[PDB]
Ligand binder design. Sequence first.
Ligand SMILES: Cc1ccc(Nc2cc(C)ncn2)cc1
Ligand SMILES: [Mg+2]
Ligand SMILES: [Zn+2]
Length: 313
Amino acid sequence: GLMQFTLPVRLCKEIELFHFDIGPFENMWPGIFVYMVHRSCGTSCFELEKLCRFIMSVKKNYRRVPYHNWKHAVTVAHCMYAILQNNHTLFTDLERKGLLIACLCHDLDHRGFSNSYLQKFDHPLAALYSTSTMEQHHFSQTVSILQLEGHNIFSTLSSSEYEQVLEIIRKAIIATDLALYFGNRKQLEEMYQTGSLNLNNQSHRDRVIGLMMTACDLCSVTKLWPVTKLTANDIYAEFWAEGDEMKKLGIQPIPMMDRDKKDEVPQGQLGFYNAVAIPCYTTLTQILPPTEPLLKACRDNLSQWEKVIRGEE
Ligand SMILES: Cc1ccc(Nc2cc(C)ncn2)cc1
Ligand SMILES: [Mg+2]
Ligand SMILES: [Zn+2]
């Protein structure tokens, strides 16, 4: 109980900021995650031995793909930590517990392919889950790991608290399906603007947690430019491989996924910032003012992509 995780001074300070990069030392990422649980939740939220065994089973079930990997899981969990730490009184005990775990598990066993490619390939998972195919699989993998012996980190919860936290995790993980984000954000925009947004309404909380999950999942676009730019290479490495697999099925991929159309990447990033990222962080900042730094960083990176197009870099 008296065993705190501490980080080196530079990490201890920078981990509190939204734009923190977890670094290239894979063996420090479990300790970074536990440090965040302990400060975000409490040293008592989880049995350290069960938590450590849960983390290492989660790690083992992420694959060696360029982007949707163990580093992404921990990066997405850090963005949730930053949001929760800047919005101390807004979230229940169960939510803080559930949401950091949801973020760590949100892409479990990702193969580097979109829901679209699974459907066109006719992957078995596509027959098992018609919509949010990979996200229903990620939640399934999470429950599977929670049921390994010595891995049930929620064992101290009551029967009703247990069902509540697994429901928080399920909705949070499903919400990382970008196809569901567009309608969710529009509904939240309308509710904020007409003044009907009510955080005591459970349906409303669910929507706000969904937007937080999109915000954390996209948080590559809220880092300092050198991080954002290098992460884009990993993102497009997956997209281009999916494009190659589309061509093998006899289907011309969308230009975003076609490695023959790399020249179009700068303009594709503009579309993505304007259609997805900026709208996402704008609505989030309206609902949770202390997340403005995510919007500010996203805007700075849009301006950097505009400079790439103008040949200034
Ligand atoms: C499946 C998936 C969806 C969105 C992202 N984030 C992105 C996307 C793009 C186009 N540019 C930068 N970041 C990554 C993966
Ligand atoms: Mg995902
Ligand atoms: Zn993700």
